[PDB]
Design a protein around this ligand. Structure first.
Ligand code: NA
Length: 129
């Protein structure tokens, strides 16, 4: 599913991301846009053989199991497919673990290079939240 901006903001808010580990909701919307263009079905392979999955491009070397990333972990205890769902639950729950891990949102490269330090409230402007 390809979310609207406002529609994903609202889903993220319902699943408890707003101000999660101190990251306001616009952070999370901005990272979804630049990671996946709001597309729950985005995948992208990496040079290391791992793949990034779903709306927040979560990586198979550490976080989910895809059966084709040797030696990798599965810290979110889930199949990487389960992150491509129209229901964002699994993606949020796993993102909460990632943002906990020490590096905050810097885990997400496109957050760091396209959202950090910018006017991220813009991403929720106009939204009935
Ligand atoms: Na894995």
């Amino acid at each position: 599913k390809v979310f609207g901006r406002c529609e994903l903001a609202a889903a993220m808010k319902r699943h408890g991301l707003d101000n999660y580990r101190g990251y306001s909701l616009g952070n999370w919307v901005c990272a979804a846009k630049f990671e996946s263009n709001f597309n729950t079905q985005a995948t992208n392979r990496n040079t290391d053989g791992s793949t990034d999955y779903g709306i927040l491009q979560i990586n198979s070397r550490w976080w989910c199991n895809d059966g084709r990333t040797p030696g990798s972990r599965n810290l979110c205890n889930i199949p990487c497919s389960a992150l491509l769902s129209s229901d964002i639950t699994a993606s949020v729950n796993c993102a909460k673990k990632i943002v906990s891990d020490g590096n905050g949102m810097n885990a997400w490269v496109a957050w760091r290079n396209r959202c950090k330090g910018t006017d991220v409230q813009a991403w929720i402007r106009g939204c009935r939240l």
